[PDB]
Design a protein around this ligand. Structure first.
Ligand SMILES: Nc1ncnc2c1ncn2[C@@H]1O[C@H](COP(=O)(O)OP(=O)(O)O)[C@@H](O)[C@H]1O
Ligand SMILES: Nc1ncnc2c1ncn2[C@@H]1O[C@H](COP(=O)(O)OP(=O)(O)O)[C@@H](O)[C@H]1O
Lengths: 149, 149
């Protein structure tokens, strides 16, 4: 069961885009299995972005990502990691195509509304960092026979 | 700070309407301050519906509301309880007007997608039943000066 970690950033919350992000995944048949709103601590954010810890903008990113609530969530379905990346669009909004989240809503790489896992290994790490196993819900989608072979 | 308790029911999750419900409140300027997905236990559901415990359909409602995950959430803003009720529409979908959630999406009172508090006192009780105070996030909406006097 492929899963990906999606997270609305503080600017996505402020601009009222939480439902929009969820709905883009639901409309593609993906199964919401976990979600919550929280203030993320600096330590959690530093671990989440550990691959970037050596970059100049790391402290600014961490301080920004803790400056208002975020909405982490988990979606499940076929090719959800790769399709999640396409649906979010390029990291830099000016490189993203219309129809993607960042192409429709963003103008600045530093205010690009949403985070999504870039690989299966990253998804598994991020899911387990933000959610305990008991927060992940299991159910069978009624439309399952019509969304994949 | 007025708050209301909104909850997507198992049929709203199955039919991919979670983001739609959130977005109707965000588009009206209301502030999302708490959300999670969970399997609700029978005991929690019986307390939530305690006013109905003497009615014939009570056990069926409780069993149904525990048959798949739900998405409880909390919104904050001026007249959010009363406006929440109008936005959801009448309990019986056939009595609800188009433009409301149940008027747009529902055909059966027993599958009417979403729950919302019917009064301020009910909202405070339900919020505290489903969420500990630490799950409620506080922030200032940037659009605050433009959504109310
Ligand atoms: N040059 C930059 N200046 C400011 N913020 C940046 C810059 N590059 C990346 N960021 C922020 O840090 C995050 C790092 O994520 P990354 O894995 O590089 O790409 P993506 O967010 O598309 O997965 C970005 O989403 C963005 O918000
Ligand atoms: N006659 C009925 N048959 C089956 N289910 C019902 C019936 N009446 C109410 N319910 C269910 O129980 C819930 C009780 O909520 P109630 O406070 O009566 O109205 P509302 O849901 O509009 O606040 C309804 O939302 C509905 O899902």
């Amino acid at each position: 069961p492929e899963r990906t970690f999606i997270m609305v950033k503080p600017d996505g919350v402020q601009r009222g885009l939480v439902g929009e992000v969820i709905q883009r995944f639901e409309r593609r048949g993906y199964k919401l299995v976990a979600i919550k709103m929280m203030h993320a601590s600096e330590q959690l954010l530093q671990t989440h972005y550990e691959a970037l810890k050596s970059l100049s903008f790391f402290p600014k990113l961490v301080a920004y990502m803790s400056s208002g609530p975020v909405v982490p969530m988990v979606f499940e379905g076929r090719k959800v990691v790769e399709n999640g990346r396409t649906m979010l669009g390029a990291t830099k909004p000016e490189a993203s195509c219309p129809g993607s989240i960042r192409g429709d809503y963003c103008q600045d790489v530093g205010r690009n509304v949403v985070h999504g896992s870039d690989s299966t290994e990253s998804a598994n790490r991020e899911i387990n960092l933000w959610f305990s196993p008991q927060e992940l819900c299991q159910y069978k989608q009624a439309v399952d026979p019509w969304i994949h072979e």
